[PDB]
Amino acid sequence: GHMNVAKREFIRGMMAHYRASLPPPEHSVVIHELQKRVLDIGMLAVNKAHVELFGSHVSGFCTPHSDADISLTYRNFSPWLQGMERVDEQNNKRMTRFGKEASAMGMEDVRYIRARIPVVQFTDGVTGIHCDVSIGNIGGVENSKILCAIRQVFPDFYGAYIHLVKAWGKAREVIAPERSTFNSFTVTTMALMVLQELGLLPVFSKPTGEFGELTVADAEMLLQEFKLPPIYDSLHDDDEKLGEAVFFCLQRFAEYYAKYDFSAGTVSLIHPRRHRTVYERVVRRHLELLGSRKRLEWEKHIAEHKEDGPLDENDFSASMQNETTQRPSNSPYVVEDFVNYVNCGRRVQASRVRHIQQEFNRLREMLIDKESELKFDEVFRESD
């Protein structure tokens, strides 16, 4: 009798889902030990092995089950050489030995994937966590650190919001990279852009990177100073109150992307709503800078390894083409990675747009229009 309580229960259920997903107290020790295990494998396969984690276990937007992204570097590694045939060949020799050593040390389901960009995938033989190892994923490491810094501002606020977006995204196949929809990183970035638009995160409008990209120190510096509205100071000890703030943000998120004009606009944390064509210009500038430095490093390698010379213009051209095809401004979605201007949304196929748009429609309808009918198990119902 005017006694509907759907919204209250939905907020309660969603904050409980968040709380249930959080890694236990000792999880940082678990992940640290995982890093050491992988380093042990690394030290067998390559000289001066160095292992960096990235992805959600670094950002902190994770569950204890979240997979692990790992970046392997070595003596005289250069981020600028990947693409050069001879060095790609060498990186394959490193990953081939890495895969064998990982099997020997007791990693399960080890799969070495031979390619110009080689990767080794496996299930950790201690935790069961799925691991992805690649050489010198410098962008990955850097953007994960920025995301970590963002979360640090108010971990449970940003944490719950992102968690629920992802949980929804996965259930509804909006986050399904193998089905040609979004990956988690791309939707995370999207969700954060809404927070920026709401004044709940600063805009990173001053990238100072050598190639015009946003750096970790750029981000940390802005966030150090950033203030949330004063009300947020009373939300740290009560999930009913905090859940009202996260609920409002989820509403805004759903509505934002059910309505966002992607024909004109991109998603960016550096410049929210920046036009596709301006992103194009930024990309073109970025690629000139990248190309100059790339060629310079290719020459430096050849000077030290003459039998790999002379510089192969065809291969160098192909490498630059690969940089270009990573940053298209005309794909169904353009979601900008702030550390390298890569379009991380580029793989989403035109035929998938309907499903993505429809799921955002459904989410908006449920969170806003049919608020009185809210049921957590319905909103986050697994697709099919």
Ligand X SMILES: O=c1ccn([C@@H]2O[C@H](COP(=O)(O)OP(=O)(O)OP(=O)(O)O)[C@@H](O)[C@H]2O)c(=O)[nH]1
Contacting positions for ligand X (CB under 6 A):
54-56, 59, 61-62, 66-67, 69, 139-140, 143-144, 166, 183-186, 188, 337, 344
State in angstroms the smallest separation of the CB of 372 from ligand X.
Answer: 32
Closer to ligand X by Cβ: residue 59 or 181:
59
Contacts 24+ apart (CB under 8 A), 288-295: 289/210, 289/211, 289/212, 290/211, 290/323, 291/320, 291/323, 293/80, 293/211, 294/80, 294/83, 294/319, 294/320
Pair type for strands 68-73 and 108-113? unpaired
Smaller CB separation from ligand X, 69 or 359 = 69
3-state secondary structure of 225: helix
* Residue 157, CB-side half-sphere exposure with 13 Å CA sphere: 23
Q: How far is the CB of 298 from ligand X (least distance, A)?
A: 23
Query: Smallest distance, Å, CB 38 to ligand X?
Result: 16
CB of 183 to ligand X, least distance (A): 4
Output the smallest distance, CB 213 to ligand X, in A. Answer: 12
Q: Give the nearest distance from C-beta 214 to ligand X in angstroms.
A: 13
Residue number with CB closer to ligand X (94 or 346)? 346
Nearest 10 degrees: CA dihedral of 238, 241, 242, 246?
160
Indicate the residue among 187 and 254 with the shorter CB distance to ligand X.
187
d(CA 184, CA 206): 25
Q: Nearest to residue 157, comparing CAs of 15, 253, 31?
A: 15
Closest separation between CB of residue 42 and ligand X, Å?
19
Q: Answer yes or no: are the C-beta atoms of 53 and 116 closer than 8 Å.
A: no
Q: Which is nearer to ligand X, 187 or 235 (CB)?
A: 187
- C-beta closer to ligand X: residue 61 or 154: 61
Decide whether 185 or 298 has the Cβ nearer to ligand X. 185
Helices (H) and strands (E) in the chain, counts: 13, 5
CB of 368 to ligand X, least distance (A): 26
Whichever of 158 and 298 has its CB closer to ligand X, that residue is 158
* Distance between CA atoms of residues 350 and 261, nearest Å: 15
Would you say 50 or 97 has its CB closer to ligand X?
Answer: 50
Least distance in Å: CB of 266 to ligand X?
Answer: 14
Element at 270 (helix H, strand E): none
In DSSP notation, 88-133 reads HHHHHHHHHHHHHHHHHHT-EEEEEE-SSS-EEEEE-TTT--EEEE
Cα–Cα distance between 290 and 45 in angstroms, integer?
Answer: 30
- Pairing mode of beta strands 68-73, 119-123: unpaired
Residues in the chain, how many? 384
Buried b (16+ CB within 10 A) or exposed e, 294-320: bbebbeebbeeeeebeeebeeebeebb
**Smallest distance from ligand X to CB 54, Å:** 5
SS3 label, residue 52: strand
Choose between 107 and 191: whose C-beta lies nearer to ligand X: 191
